[PDB]
Design a protein around this ligand. Structure first.
Ligand SMILES: Cc1cc2nc3c(=O)[nH]c(=O)nc-3n(C[C@H](O)[C@H](O)[C@H](O)COP(=O)(O)OP(=O)(O)OC[C@H]3O[C@@H](n4cnc5c(N)ncnc54)[C@H](O)[C@@H]3O)c2cc1C
Length: 303
């Protein structure tokens, strides 16, 4: 557990469930604006007093307090790290998460059911101690290649690892802190949310787009405000279909990396769109994609 640093460049499992790192909540800020749907909080934790180090694209576990319905201790839940390795204040002292409160239906006994860890995290007060494990994950890592093209397909909290890439790529303080990574490639974020007030980190994403118009393109798929051509609500798969030929042309570049993150269910529609585009040039997308995965250029993390 605490002895867990005898390997690689990528930090993994510095802390494990049997002896987690006890961090303190610094802040818990709301990301969904009035008129939006649900509760998504940006939570920042203090890492001082421990040796938790991490990089962009990784996740950490949070062990919530309490026991389940069988009286057994609650197990950890994984959350994509929402901050760069340097933390939101670029001081190498914190870590942030983007947590949506899970809440649902009646055909699952009772009435409104609240997710255990997500409700715990979203209502947590500053100063509270939290059990943190990790980091974990080697599937959503960003290439060190500054000339890479990075396609990001995200829905909801799937924006979390995207925020770590984008901040590392475009924030002034990040560029001053990472001399070795001066991004000059092209990044395209297609972000699906139900409403405008639900666009997590809207002000900052749009700020990046304004400062870097040739290096970053921002595309939204807002279901309660936009309709696709078939008359249905606009989802991320619809924007992908809309730009399938373009996305396929970018994917053909040897330097292109594609990242997919969010709730499970988005993948099938994205593949269908890219398959139709790939087919025009006599390529079977399912086969091409396996090669991309093997080459480490197709990154997916859905849950
Ligand atoms: C790698 C990874 C990264 C993740 N990153 C994030 C992140 O950045 N942000 C974030 O918010 N979450 C993230 N998640 C999901 C997160 O780990 C927890 O699953 C989620 O927060 C819910 O946990 P809970 O403790 O709130 O719910 P639980 O109390 O554990 O309830 C979960 C159970 O409720 C059920 N369920 C789920 N949705 C519904 C629904 N609408 N209808 C019916 N039943 C349902 C299932 O039985 C599920 O097992 C990530 C998951 C993984 C695996």
């Amino acid at each position: 557990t605490q002895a867990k640093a005898k390997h690689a460049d990528v930090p993994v499992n510095l802390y494990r469930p049997n002896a987690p790192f006890i961090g303190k909540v610094i802040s818990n800020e709301p990301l969904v604006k009035e008129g939006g749907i649900g509760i998504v909080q940006h939570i920042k934790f203090d890492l001082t007093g421990g040796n938790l180090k991490y990089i962009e694209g990784q996740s950490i576990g949070i062990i919530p307090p309490g026991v389940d319905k069988n009286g057994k201790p609650e197990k950890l839940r994984l959350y994509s790290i929402a901050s760069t390795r340097h933390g939101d204040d670029v001081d190498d002292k914190t870590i942030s998460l983007c947590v949506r409160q899970l809440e649902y239906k009646h055909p699952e006994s009772g009435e409104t059911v609240y997710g255990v860890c997500s409700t715990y995290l979203t209502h947590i007060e500053p100063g509270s101690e939290v059990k943190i494990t990790g980091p974990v994950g080697k599937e959503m890592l960003l290439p060190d290649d500054p000339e890479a093209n990075v396609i990001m397909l995200a829905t909801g909290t799937g924006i979390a690892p995207m925020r770590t890439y984008l901040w590392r790529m475009f924030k002034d303080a990040e560029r001053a802190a990472n001399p070795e990574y001066q991004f000059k490639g092209f990044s395209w974020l297609v972000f699906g949310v139900p409403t405008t007030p639900n666009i997590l980190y809207k002000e900052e994403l749009e700020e990046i787009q304004q400062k870097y118009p040739d290096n970053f393109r921002l595309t939204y798929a807002i279901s309660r405000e936009q309709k696709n051509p078939q008359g249905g609500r606009m989802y991320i798969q619809d924007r992908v279909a809309e730009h399938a030929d373009q996305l396929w042309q970018l994917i053909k570049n040897q330097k292109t990396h594609t990242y997919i993150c969010g709730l499970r269910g988005m993948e099938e529609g994205i593949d269908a769109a890219l398959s139709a585009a790939a087919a025009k040039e006599g390529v079977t997308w399912s086969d091409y994609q396996k090669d991309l995965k093997k080459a480490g250029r197709w990154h997916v993390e859905t849950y």
